[PDB]
Amino acid sequence: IFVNPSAIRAGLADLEMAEETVDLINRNIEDNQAHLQEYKYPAIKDLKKPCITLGKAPDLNKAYKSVLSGMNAAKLDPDDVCSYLAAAMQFFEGTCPEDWTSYGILIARKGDKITPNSLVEIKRNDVEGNWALTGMEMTRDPTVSEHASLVGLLLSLYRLSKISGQNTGNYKTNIADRIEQIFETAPFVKIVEHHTLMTTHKMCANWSTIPNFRFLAGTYDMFFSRIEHLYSAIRVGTVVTAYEDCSGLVSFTGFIKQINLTAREAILYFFHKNFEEEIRRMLEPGQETAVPHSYFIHFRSLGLSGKSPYSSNAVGHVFNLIHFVGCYMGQIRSLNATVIAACAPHEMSVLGGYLGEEFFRGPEAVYARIMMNGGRLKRSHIRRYVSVSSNHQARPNSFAEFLNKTYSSD
Domains annotated on the chain, with CATH: 5-29+244-407 (1.10.3610.10), 51-241 (1.10.3570.10)
Query: Which experiment gave this structure?
Result: X-ray
- Give the Cα separation of 172 and 204 in Å (integer): 14
Burial class, 316, CB count within 10 angstroms (exposed 0-12 / middle 13-18 / buried 19+): buried
- Give the Cα separation of 251 and 317 in Å (integer): 12
Break positions in the chain: residue before each gap, C to N over 2.5 angstroms: 37, 135, 360
164-194 CB burial, b ≥16 within 10 A, e <16: eeeeeeeebeebbeebbebbbeeebbebbee
Look at residue 209 and give its three-state secondary structure.
helix
Single-letter amino acid, residue 23: D
Q: CA dist 194 to 19, 72, 153, 178, 190, Å? A: 46, 10, 12, 11, 10
CB 204 within 8 A of CB 76: yes
Q: Would you put residue 51 in left (φ > 0), alpha (ψ -120 to 50) or beta?
A: beta
Burial class, 306, CB count within 10 angstroms (exposed 0-12 / middle 13-18 / buried 19+): exposed
Please give the backbone phi and psi of residue 51, each rounded to the nearest 5 degrees, phi first.
-145, 155
Nominal resolution (angstroms): 2.0
Single-letter amino acid, residue 259: I
Look at residue 152 and give its three-state secondary structure.
helix
DSSP string, 220-262: HHHHHHHS--TTGGGHHHHGGGTTTT-HHHHHHHHHHHHTT--
Q: Is the dihedral of CA 287, 288, 289, 294 positive or negative?
A: negative
- Give the Cα separation of 378 and 181 in Å (integer): 52
Look at residue 51 and give its three-state secondary structure.
strand
Q: Is the dihedral of CA 102, 108, 114, 119 positive or negative?
A: negative
Q: Would you put residue 103 in left (φ > 0), alpha (ψ -120 to 50) or beta?
A: left
